[PDB]
Amino acid sequence: SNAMEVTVPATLNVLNGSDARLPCTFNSAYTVNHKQFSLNWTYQECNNCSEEMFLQFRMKIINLKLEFQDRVEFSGNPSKYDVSVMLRNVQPEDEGIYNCYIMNPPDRHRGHGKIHLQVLM
């Protein structure tokens, strides 16, 4: 009621070289209008580190192709309240914080999910 519920794993542990699905779903009393829905995914190397946007939904998916190489993919379905992303062939440098920011107009509250991705040997 006082915020948009966003469900993500607080910590996600993935083996080096495997594919990492970053799950993110949300709740809203309004359906998802692709002409107004907003999604931003950002990455940080560390807690205090600058955020780097790497994927957006604005009318459609925009993959910013950050020099992640071409390993980021969208893995969700906005109309089904799923905004997950996929990081293929995870590398040690992918360790860090992944933020999902969600707006579903006319729902007032913005959602925020935060995942700490850790890369195992």
Author numbering: 27 to 93, 95 to 148
Describing publication, verbatim:
Voltage-gated sodium (Nav) channels are part of membrane-embedded signaling complexes that initiate the rising phase of action potentials, a crucial event in generating and propagating electrical signals throughout the human body. As key components of these protein assemblies, β-subunits (1) modify Nav channel-gating properties; (2) regulate channel trafficking and localization to distinct surface compartments; and (3) influence channel oligomerization.
The construct encompasses residues 30–153, and contains a single Cys mutation (C55A) to facilitate crystallization [The C55A mutation is located on the protein surface and therefore unlikely to affect the overall structure.]. The hβ2 configuration displays an Ig-like fold, consisting of eleven β-strands and three 310 helices. The first, intra-subunit bond, is strictly conserved among all four β-subunit isoforms and is mediated by 50Cys and 127Cys buried within the core where it links two opposing faces of the protein. The second intra-subunit bond is located within a loop that spans residues 70–77 and connects strand β5 to β6 via 72Cys - 75Cys. This loop constitutes a unique feature of hβ2 since corresponding cysteines are absent in β1, β3, and β4. The loop containing the 72Cys- 75Cys disulfide bond is modeled in a dual conformation. The hβ2 subunit possesses a corresponding Cys at position 55 that is located in a longer loop which may result in an altered spatial position of this residue when compared to hβ4.
